[PDB]
Every structure is written in structure tokens, then in C-alpha cells.
Amino acid sequence: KETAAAKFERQHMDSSTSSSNYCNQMMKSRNLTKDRCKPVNTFVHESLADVQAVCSQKNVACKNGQTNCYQSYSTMSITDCRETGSSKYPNCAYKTTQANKHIIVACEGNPYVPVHFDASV
Ligand SMILES: O=c1ccn([C@H]2O[C@@H](COP(=O)(O)O)[C@H](O)[C@@H]2O)c(=O)[nH]1
Structure with a gap:
């Protein structure tokens, strides 16, 4: 079905923009x-082109x-979503944290594109 590159985009790209409720909504809508x-x-x-x-x-x-x-040479605008201690499936709850950091992705394939989000630094 979904390619590894497509899954990366689903799980990790949001070029479209956060608030305190961003992660609650986003983790849900992206099927995480x-x-x-x-x-x-x-x-x-x-932009996808920048991340690629x-x-x-x-x-x-x-x-x-x-x-x-x-690792990106430039810092990038990111949002980390981390499950809270009182989060219970299926009502998953996250703290939303915005930051500007270098990203690290794993890349694979031809074309050689991001398939995994490894870390931010
Ligand atoms: O800074 C981090 C660290 C891990 N991750 C998530 O990315 C996971 C790697 O799986 P994947 O990128 O293939 O969905 C990792 O185990 C963790 O769930 C982040 O998005 N950001």
C-alpha cells in the first residue's frame, strides 16, 4: 500500500503551518x-523539498x-509530540513542544528520500 517515503510524509511532515492541542489532533488525524x-x-x-x-x-x-x-545543516521548525503520563489508549494525550532544531532522518531508495525520523539536535 503506502510506500516508506509516503509513510514518512504521513507521520512526520506538516508543511501547512501550533497550539497546546496540536499533538492531540495531529497524532489522531495522521493515524498514529x-x-x-x-x-x-x-x-x-x-517544505517537502527542504526535508528531502x-x-x-x-x-x-x-x-x-x-x-x-x-542531519540538516540548517535548523528546522519542528513540533515534538510526547505522550503524557495520564494518557490511556484509545484517548491518547500528548504534550506539544515547538522548537527549532537540526533534524536527523534515515534515507533509503531510488530516489533517495527520508523513510525514518531518527532524532533532533
Ligand atoms: O525525536 C524523535 C525521536 C523519535 N521519533 C519517533 O520516530 C520513531 C521511528 O519510527 P518511524 O520514523 O519509522 O515512524 C521513533 O522510534 C519514535 O517513535 C520521533 O518522531 N522523533
């Missing part, structure tokens, strides 16, 4: 609360020890 409350998830508020370009930027080790992760 379907089977489980996804504990941690980041949305990137840059990260796959030709600074090559860094992935957290899992693979070598196909890439």
Missing part, C-alpha cells in the same frame, strides 16, 4: 493512535547503528 498510542513523534514544518534535501546533507550514524542517517 490507531493501534497504540505512539509515544514520541515529531512533525516538521518545512537533508538526504544529501551531513551523513551521521543512526541510533540503531546503521550509516544512512543525515
Whole structure:
């Protein structure tokens, strides 16, 4: 069905813009609360082209020890969503935290595009 690149865009891209309720709404609408409350998830508020370009930027080790992760040279506008301590599926609750940080994504395929959000720094 959904490609890895498409799933990345679904789980991590929001070029369209946050408020205190952003994560509650967004995690729901992007289907990250379907089977489980996804504990941690980041949305990137840059253009797709800008985020895709990260796959030709600074090559860094992935957290899992693979070598196909890439760090943005520039900081990017992001929102971190983190499940609260009182969150209970299926009413998943998140704290919304905006920041401007370098992103690290894993890239794969031809074309070579982001498939996983690894970290922000
Ligand atoms: O800063 C972070 C750290 C992890 N993640 C999430 O991204 C997950 C990696 O899975 P994927 O990007 O393939 O959905 C990771 O395990 C965590 O759930 C973020 O979005 N941002």
C-alpha cells in the first residue's frame, strides 16, 4: 500500500503551518493512535523539498547503528509530540513542544528520500 517515503510524509511532515492541542489532533488525524498510542513523534514544518534535501546533507550514524542517517545543516521548525503520563489508549494525550532544531532522518531508495525520523539536535 503506502510506500516508506509516503509513510514518512504521513507521520512526520506538516508543511501547512501550533497550539497546546496540536499533538492531540495531529497524532489522531495522521493515524498514529490507531493501534497504540505512539509515544514520541515529531512533525516538521518545512517544505517537502527542504526535508528531502537533508538526504544529501551531513551523513551521521543512526541510533540503531546503521550509516544512512543525515542531519540538516540548517535548523528546522519542528513540533515534538510526547505522550503524557495520564494518557490511556484509545484517548491518547500528548504534550506539544515547538522548537527549532537540526533534524536527523534515515534515507533509503531510488530516489533517495527520508523513510525514518531518527532524532533532533
Ligand atoms: O525525536 C524523535 C525521536 C523519535 N521519533 C519517533 O520516530 C520513531 C521511528 O519510527 P518511524 O520514523 O519509522 O515512524 C521513533 O522510534 C519514535 O517513535 C520521533 O518522531 N522523533
